[PDB]
Design a protein around this ligand. Sequence first.
Ligand SMILES: [Fe+3]
Ligand SMILES: [Fe+3]
Ligand SMILES: [Fe+3]
Ligand SMILES: [Fe+3]
Ligand SMILES: [Fe+3]
Ligand SMILES: [Fe+3]
Ligand SMILES: [Fe+3]
Ligand SMILES: [Fe+3]
Ligand SMILES: [Fe+3]
Ligand SMILES: [Fe+3]
Ligand SMILES: [Fe+3]
Ligand SMILES: [Fe+3]
Ligand SMILES: [Fe+3]
Ligand SMILES: [Fe+3]
Ligand SMILES: [Fe+3]
Ligand SMILES: [Fe+3]
Ligand SMILES: [Fe+3]
Ligand SMILES: [Fe+3]
Ligand SMILES: [Fe+3]
Ligand SMILES: [Fe+3]
Ligand SMILES: [Fe+3]
Ligand SMILES: [Fe+3]
Ligand SMILES: [Fe+3]
Ligand SMILES: [Fe+3]
Ligand SMILES: [Fe+3]
Ligand SMILES: [Fe+3]
Ligand SMILES: [Fe+3]
Ligand SMILES: [Fe+3]
Ligand SMILES: [Fe+3]
Ligand SMILES: [Fe+3]
Ligand SMILES: [Fe+3]
Ligand SMILES: [Fe+3]
Ligand SMILES: [Fe+3]
Ligand SMILES: [Fe+3]
Ligand SMILES: [Fe+3]
Ligand SMILES: [Fe+3]
Ligand SMILES: [Fe+3]
Ligand SMILES: [Fe+3]
Ligand SMILES: [Fe+3]
Ligand SMILES: [Fe+3]
Ligand SMILES: [Fe+3]
Ligand SMILES: [Fe+3]
Ligand SMILES: [Fe+3]
Ligand SMILES: [Fe+3]
Ligand SMILES: [Fe+3]
Ligand SMILES: [Fe+3]
Ligand SMILES: [Fe+3]
Ligand SMILES: [Fe+3]
Ligand SMILES: [Fe+3]
Ligand SMILES: [Fe+3]
Ligand SMILES: [Fe+3]
Ligand SMILES: [Fe+3]
Ligand SMILES: [Fe+3]
Ligand SMILES: [Fe+3]
Ligand SMILES: [Fe+3]
Ligand SMILES: [Fe+3]
Ligand SMILES: [Fe+3]
Ligand SMILES: [Fe+3]
Ligand SMILES: [Fe+3]
Ligand SMILES: [Fe+3]
Ligand SMILES: [Fe+3]
Ligand SMILES: [Fe+3]
Ligand SMILES: [Fe+3]
Ligand SMILES: [Fe+3]
Ligand SMILES: [Fe+3]
Ligand SMILES: [Fe+3]
Ligand SMILES: [Fe+3]
Ligand SMILES: [Fe+3]
Ligand SMILES: [Fe+3]
Ligand SMILES: [Fe+3]
Ligand SMILES: [Fe+3]
Ligand SMILES: [Fe+3]
Ligand SMILES: [Fe+3]
Ligand SMILES: [Fe+3]
Ligand SMILES: [Fe+3]
Ligand SMILES: [Fe+3]
Ligand SMILES: [Fe+3]
Ligand SMILES: [Fe+3]
Ligand SMILES: [Fe+3]
Ligand SMILES: [Fe+3]
Ligand SMILES: [Fe+3]
Ligand SMILES: [Fe+3]
Ligand SMILES: [Fe+3]
Ligand SMILES: [Fe+3]
Ligand SMILES: [Fe+3]
Ligand SMILES: [Fe+3]
Ligand SMILES: [Fe+3]
Ligand SMILES: [Fe+3]
Ligand SMILES: [Fe+3]
Ligand SMILES: [Fe+3]
Ligand SMILES: [Fe+3]
Ligand SMILES: [Fe+3]
Lengths: 165, 165, 165, 165, 165, 165, 165
Amino acid sequence: KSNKINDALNQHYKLNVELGLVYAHYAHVADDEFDMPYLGKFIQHLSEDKLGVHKEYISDYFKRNGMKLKTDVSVAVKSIPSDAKALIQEVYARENEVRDHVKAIAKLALAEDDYESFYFIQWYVRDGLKDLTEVDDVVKLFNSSNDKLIIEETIKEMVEHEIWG
Amino acid sequence: KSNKINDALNQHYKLNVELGLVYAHYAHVADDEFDMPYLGKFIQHLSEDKLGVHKEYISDYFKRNGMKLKTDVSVAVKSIPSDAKALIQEVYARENEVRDHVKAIAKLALAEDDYESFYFIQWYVRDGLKDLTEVDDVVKLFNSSNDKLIIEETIKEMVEHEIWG
Amino acid sequence: KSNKINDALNQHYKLNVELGLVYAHYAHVADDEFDMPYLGKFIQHLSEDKLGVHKEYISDYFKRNGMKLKTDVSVAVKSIPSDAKALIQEVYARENEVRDHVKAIAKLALAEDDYESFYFIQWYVRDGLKDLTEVDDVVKLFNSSNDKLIIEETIKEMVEHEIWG
Amino acid sequence: KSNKINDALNQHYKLNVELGLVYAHYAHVADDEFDMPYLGKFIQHLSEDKLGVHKEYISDYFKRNGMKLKTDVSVAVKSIPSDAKALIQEVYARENEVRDHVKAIAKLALAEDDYESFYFIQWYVRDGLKDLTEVDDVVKLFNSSNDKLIIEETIKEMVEHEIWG
Amino acid sequence: KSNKINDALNQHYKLNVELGLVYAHYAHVADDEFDMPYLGKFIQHLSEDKLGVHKEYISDYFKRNGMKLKTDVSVAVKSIPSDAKALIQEVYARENEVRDHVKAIAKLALAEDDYESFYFIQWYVRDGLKDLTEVDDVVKLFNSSNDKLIIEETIKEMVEHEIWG
Amino acid sequence: KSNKINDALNQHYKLNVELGLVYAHYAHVADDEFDMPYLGKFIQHLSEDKLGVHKEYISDYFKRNGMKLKTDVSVAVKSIPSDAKALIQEVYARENEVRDHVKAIAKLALAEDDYESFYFIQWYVRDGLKDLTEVDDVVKLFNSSNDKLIIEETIKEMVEHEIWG
Amino acid sequence: KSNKINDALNQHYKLNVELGLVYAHYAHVADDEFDMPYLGKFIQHLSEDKLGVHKEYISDYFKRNGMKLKTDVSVAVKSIPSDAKALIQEVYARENEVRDHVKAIAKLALAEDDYESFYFIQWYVRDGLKDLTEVDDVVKLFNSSNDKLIIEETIKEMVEHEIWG
Ligand SMILES: [Fe+3]
Ligand SMILES: [Fe+3]
Ligand SMILES: [Fe+3]
Ligand SMILES: [Fe+3]
Ligand SMILES: [Fe+3]
Ligand SMILES: [Fe+3]
Ligand SMILES: [Fe+3]
Ligand SMILES: [Fe+3]
Ligand SMILES: [Fe+3]
Ligand SMILES: [Fe+3]
Ligand SMILES: [Fe+3]
Ligand SMILES: [Fe+3]
Ligand SMILES: [Fe+3]
Ligand SMILES: [Fe+3]
Ligand SMILES: [Fe+3]
Ligand SMILES: [Fe+3]
Ligand SMILES: [Fe+3]
Ligand SMILES: [Fe+3]
Ligand SMILES: [Fe+3]
Ligand SMILES: [Fe+3]
Ligand SMILES: [Fe+3]
Ligand SMILES: [Fe+3]
Ligand SMILES: [Fe+3]
Ligand SMILES: [Fe+3]
Ligand SMILES: [Fe+3]
Ligand SMILES: [Fe+3]
Ligand SMILES: [Fe+3]
Ligand SMILES: [Fe+3]
Ligand SMILES: [Fe+3]
Ligand SMILES: [Fe+3]
Ligand SMILES: [Fe+3]
Ligand SMILES: [Fe+3]
Ligand SMILES: [Fe+3]
Ligand SMILES: [Fe+3]
Ligand SMILES: [Fe+3]
Ligand SMILES: [Fe+3]
Ligand SMILES: [Fe+3]
Ligand SMILES: [Fe+3]
Ligand SMILES: [Fe+3]
Ligand SMILES: [Fe+3]
Ligand SMILES: [Fe+3]
Ligand SMILES: [Fe+3]
Ligand SMILES: [Fe+3]
Ligand SMILES: [Fe+3]
Ligand SMILES: [Fe+3]
Ligand SMILES: [Fe+3]
Ligand SMILES: [Fe+3]
Ligand SMILES: [Fe+3]
Ligand SMILES: [Fe+3]
Ligand SMILES: [Fe+3]
Ligand SMILES: [Fe+3]
Ligand SMILES: [Fe+3]
Ligand SMILES: [Fe+3]
Ligand SMILES: [Fe+3]
Ligand SMILES: [Fe+3]
Ligand SMILES: [Fe+3]
Ligand SMILES: [Fe+3]
Ligand SMILES: [Fe+3]
Ligand SMILES: [Fe+3]
Ligand SMILES: [Fe+3]
Ligand SMILES: [Fe+3]
Ligand SMILES: [Fe+3]
Ligand SMILES: [Fe+3]
Ligand SMILES: [Fe+3]
Ligand SMILES: [Fe+3]
Ligand SMILES: [Fe+3]
Ligand SMILES: [Fe+3]
Ligand SMILES: [Fe+3]
Ligand SMILES: [Fe+3]
Ligand SMILES: [Fe+3]
Ligand SMILES: [Fe+3]
Ligand SMILES: [Fe+3]
Ligand SMILES: [Fe+3]
Ligand SMILES: [Fe+3]
Ligand SMILES: [Fe+3]
Ligand SMILES: [Fe+3]
Ligand SMILES: [Fe+3]
Ligand SMILES: [Fe+3]
Ligand SMILES: [Fe+3]
Ligand SMILES: [Fe+3]
Ligand SMILES: [Fe+3]
Ligand SMILES: [Fe+3]
Ligand SMILES: [Fe+3]
Ligand SMILES: [Fe+3]
Ligand SMILES: [Fe+3]
Ligand SMILES: [Fe+3]
Ligand SMILES: [Fe+3]
Ligand SMILES: [Fe+3]
Ligand SMILES: [Fe+3]
Ligand SMILES: [Fe+3]
Ligand SMILES: [Fe+3]
Ligand SMILES: [Fe+3]
C-alpha cells in the first residue's frame, strides 16, 4: 500500500467533498438570485455527483487495499460570481483543475507501480473529461443567446458514449 | 424575514453538512475496521439523509422566503470510537443534540411570530425523533448479543408511522 | 493539449478514412470479380466500421479536449489482388499495421503524460486485435477448403468477448 | 455497357465520397467551433448519406451491368467558412452542383440509349432536389433568427413525400 | 510477440490451474472435515473461477496474438490447515500472491511496450482485488463469531461494483 | 469403507483432472494451429466435463462414505499430434482407456461387496461409452471428407438416449 | 422366486415399519421434551419415508414376482436418549445398520442369480446412503453450535443429486 497514493486520493476525496458543497451553494444561487432554476438543477446534479460516487469510490477502494481514510473538510463560499455566465464559467475552471489533479494521480500510480490504483483512477480519468464536456455544453449557451429563458429551456432538455461514459 | 431565524437555520444547515461528513467516515470505519458492513450501510444512509434533504429543505425554504444561504463548513474526524458499540453510541449522542437544536428553532419561530418557519420546522421536529429511534434500535442490538454477526444480520433486515414518518 | 498526440490521431483518422475507402472497393471486387458475395459483405462491414466509429471517436475526442481536426485524404486503388485468398490476405496485412500504429499512439500518450489520450486509445488497442482476429478467421477458410461455396457458406454464418469486444 | 456512362458514374461516386468527407469535417466544426451540436448532427447525417447509399447504389449497379469501379479520392479541407450561416450556405452551393452533375448523367443516358442507367439515375434526380430542400430549410433559419439557440432548437425537431422521397 | 510476456502468462496459466485444483480440495475439506458446506461452496466457486475463465482468457489471448500455450501442471495437497479459519486464511494468502504476480505482468507489458497485453491484464488487475475482497469478507466472519453455524448462515447469503466487477 | 476402492477412485479422480487439462490444451490447438474452432469447442466441452462432474461426483461420494480425497496432479503436454485427425484419434484412445479403468472399479466393488460403490460407478460405466460414442462420431468425419470446413460445419451441429445418457 | 430373498425382504419390510414407528416417537420427543420443533419435523419426515415407500416398494415388488408378504411387527420405545444430540445420533446409528442390511440383500441377490431383486434393491442401496447423509447433516449441527435455536433455524432451511436421489 503506497503512502503517496493514499495521500493523493485523500486529497482527491477532500476536493470532491468541498467542491460538491460549493456547487450546492452555486445551485441555490443559480435559481434564487439569477432566476435560472434549470441551471441550478444542472449544478445540483454535479454537486450530488461529487459528494456521492466521487467520494464513495475512494472509500470503497480503501476498504479493499488497506489505505486509511482521512476526513479533513474546510470550505467557505465567501464571494459569488456576478451573473449566471460567470457562475458556470467558474464551475468550468474548477472542473479543469480536476483533470489536472487526476492526471497527477495516474502519473503517480505508474511511478509507484501501483497498477490497481492506475486501474482504479481510469474511471476518474474518463469522468474528468465527461464532467468537463457537460459543463462546457452549458457555458456555451451563454455565448449563443442573450435570453435567459432560451438558455433555461435548452438546459432543461440536457437534464430531462462508449468511451467517455 | 427574521435574521435570527436565518442565522439559526444556517446553523442547522452547517450541522447537517458536517454531521453527514462525519457519518460518511463512521460508515467507512464500521465496515473496514469493525468488520460490520451492514452497520456501515445503516450509517451511510444516515449520512446521505443529512447531506441530502436535511440541507436541501433549508435552501429550498430560503429561495421562497428571502433568507440568505451561508456555506461555512469545517469538520475534521480526528479520533474514532474504539469499537462498534461506542461508534453507534456516538451517533446517538449526536442525534440527541439534533433534537435540542431543532427545539430551539421551534421556540424561536414562535417568539418571532414566524409561523411559516414554525410550520417548516415541524418536519425537523418529527424527523428529530424518528432518526433517533432508528439509531436507538441499533444501539440496542449491542446490549442484546455478544455476537457481531447476529447483530449484523439483524441490522440487515432493518435496511432491507402515521405521526413520526 | 499535446501537439504530437493531435498529429498522431489526425494521422490515425486519415488511416481509417482511406482504409475504409480501400475496403469499400475490395468489397465490390470480392462479389463482382471473385463471385463471393459474403466475403464482400464481411469486407463492407469492415469498411463501414473504419469510416464510421473509428473516425467519429477521434473527432468526438477532439471536440472535448481542444485538438484540431484535419481532413487530408488521398487514396487510389490502382491494383487489385489476383484472387480472393490474396484479397483477404491483403486486408490482414493492413490490419496488422493498424496494431502497430495504435501501439505507437499508446506509447506516446504515456511519454507525454496524456492519460486521457491513453484511456481514449485503449478502445483502439482492443479493437486492433479484434478486427485482426475477425479478418484472420476468414483468411483461414482459404487454407481449409478448395471450394469457394463452402467458404462462402462459412463466412455467412460469421455475419448472420469480455476483454476484446 | 457505355464507357461514357461508366466514366460519369465513377465521377459521381468520387463526388459523393469526397463530399461526405468534407461534410464530416463541416459537422465537427459546426459543433466544436460554432457551438451548434444539432446543425452538426444535420450535417453528419448528410455526410453518412453521401458516403453510404449514394456510393453503394453506384457500385451495386456496376456489379449488375458490367461497369468498372474506380476508387480515386483526393480531398483536403483547407479553409472553413467563418460562421455557421456561411457553413450551411456552403453545403447548399455544393448540393446545387449535385443537381447539375445528376442532370448531365440523365441527359447522357438518353443520348446513349442507356435506359437502365436512365432508370437508375432517376433516384439521384429525385434525391438531388430532396437533399437540397432539407439543406435549404436550414439555411433559412439563419435568415429568420439572430439567436443560435432558437435555430438550434428548430434544427432539432428536423432531425427527431410521395414524389420526392 | 514478446517471449517474456508469453512466459509470464504461461506462468499465470499454471498458477490458476494449480490453485483451482488446490481449492477444489480445500472445498471438499471445508464441508467434509470442518462441517461447513457453505464455506466449501464459496471455495468451490473460487476453484471453478480459477480453472475456468482465468485460464481460458489466457489461451484465447494466445490464439489471437501468436503466443504459445504450455501445459505443465504439478500440484500435490500434502497438508491441510487445522481448522476452517486457517483454511480460508490460507486462501487469502494465496490470493494476495495473485495480486503480486499480476502486478509483475502489468509492469512487464509497459516495459516491453506490449499495450495489447497491458490492456489484456487490466482484467486480472481488477479481478485480483475483487477475489481478494470476497475471500476477505469470509476470513472476517471467523473474527466476529465463535459459532460455526452463524458463520455458515452468513456465508450462504454471500453465495445466494462499477470499478471492481 | 474399502481402502482398495478409495485408492481406485482417487486414481480415477487424478485421471479426470489430468485428462481434462490435456483436453484444454488439445482444444486450444484444434482452433489455433489446426484452424478448426468447432472441433476445439467439442474438445473444450469434454475438458470441462472431465474437470467438472467427473471429479465432483467422486469427492461428493467421499463426503458421504468416509473415504479420503487425495489431490496429486502431474501432467505435461510435451508433444501435440500432427494434424486434426490424429488429435481427435488421440482423444478416442484416451477415452477407451477410461472404459478399461472404469470396468476395473466395477469388478473391484463386486469383489469387495461394496454395493454403494458398484451403484456409484454405474454412472461412470454408462458415461464411459457415451463419451466414447461422441468422440467416435467426430473421428469418423475425418474419414468421410477431405474438407476441413465441411467437417467443421458438421461438428457445429453436434454442439448446437434412455440407456446411455 | 427365491425363498431366501423373500425372507430377507420380509425382514427389511419389518425393519422399515418398526423404525418408522420409533422415529414417530422420536419426532414427538424432539419437539415436546427437547423443544426443537424443526428437528421433530426432520425426524417425522424420516418416519413417513420409512412407513411409506420403503415398505410399499417391497409389497408392490411381491405382487409382481410371487413372493409372500408377512406382517409381524413388534416394537416398544422403552428408553429415550437424554438430549437432542444423542437422539439424532441414535437415528444415525440406526440408519447405518440399514446400509448393512441392504448390502446383505444385494449380495444375496447376486448369489441367487436374482437379477430382478438385484435391480429392485439398487433403489435401497442408493437411498441407504442418502438418508444417512441427511441425518448426518443434522448430527453435525450439534457439533457446530451450543445454541438450540441456531441449530433449529438451520434445520428449518433443510426442510423448507444425479446419483444419490
Ligand atoms: Fe486532488
Ligand atoms: Fe437566496
Ligand atoms: Fe487541518
Ligand atoms: Fe509521479
Ligand atoms: Fe517504472
Ligand atoms: Fe462525474
Ligand atoms: Fe470529473
Ligand atoms: Fe420543448
Ligand atoms: Fe424536448
Ligand atoms: Fe420538449
Ligand atoms: Fe419534454
Ligand atoms: Fe420523456
Ligand atoms: Fe414528454
Ligand atoms: Fe443547529
Ligand atoms: Fe479503512
Ligand atoms: Fe469561519
Ligand atoms: Fe426563543
Ligand atoms: Fe407572542
Ligand atoms: Fe432524517
Ligand atoms: Fe433528525
Ligand atoms: Fe433472514
Ligand atoms: Fe428477512
Ligand atoms: Fe431474511
Ligand atoms: Fe431477505
Ligand atoms: Fe424483499
Ligand atoms: Fe427475499
Ligand atoms: Fe496511424
Ligand atoms: Fe465490377
Ligand atoms: Fe497533402
Ligand atoms: Fe513515444
Ligand atoms: Fe514519465
Ligand atoms: Fe473495428
Ligand atoms: Fe482495428
Ligand atoms: Fe446452414
Ligand atoms: Fe446456421
Ligand atoms: Fe444455417
Ligand atoms: Fe440461418
Ligand atoms: Fe437467426
Ligand atoms: Fe434462421
Ligand atoms: Fe458527378
Ligand atoms: Fe475542433
Ligand atoms: Fe489521380
Ligand atoms: Fe449528353
Ligand atoms: Fe436518340
Ligand atoms: Fe441523399
Ligand atoms: Fe442529392
Ligand atoms: Fe420542443
Ligand atoms: Fe417537438
Ligand atoms: Fe419538443
Ligand atoms: Fe421532443
Ligand atoms: Fe417522439
Ligand atoms: Fe417526446
Ligand atoms: Fe503468475
Ligand atoms: Fe473427506
Ligand atoms: Fe516440469
Ligand atoms: Fe518489468
Ligand atoms: Fe518505455
Ligand atoms: Fe476471479
Ligand atoms: Fe484474482
Ligand atoms: Fe436468512
Ligand atoms: Fe436472506
Ligand atoms: Fe434469508
Ligand atoms: Fe433466502
Ligand atoms: Fe432469492
Ligand atoms: Fe427466497
Ligand atoms: Fe482410473
Ligand atoms: Fe497457439
Ligand atoms: Fe507424487
Ligand atoms: Fe477385482
Ligand atoms: Fe463374492
Ligand atoms: Fe462424460
Ligand atoms: Fe467417459
Ligand atoms: Fe446448417
Ligand atoms: Fe442446422
Ligand atoms: Fe443449420
Ligand atoms: Fe443453426
Ligand atoms: Fe436452435
Ligand atoms: Fe437457428
Ligand atoms: Fe433388514
Ligand atoms: Fe402376494
Ligand atoms: Fe413373532
Ligand atoms: Fe449371500
Ligand atoms: Fe454366480
Ligand atoms: Fe429414504
Ligand atoms: Fe435408507
Ligand atoms: Fe437468520
Ligand atoms: Fe432465514
Ligand atoms: Fe432461507
Ligand atoms: Fe430464510
Ligand atoms: Fe424462508
Ligand atoms: Fe420458498
Ligand atoms: Fe420465502
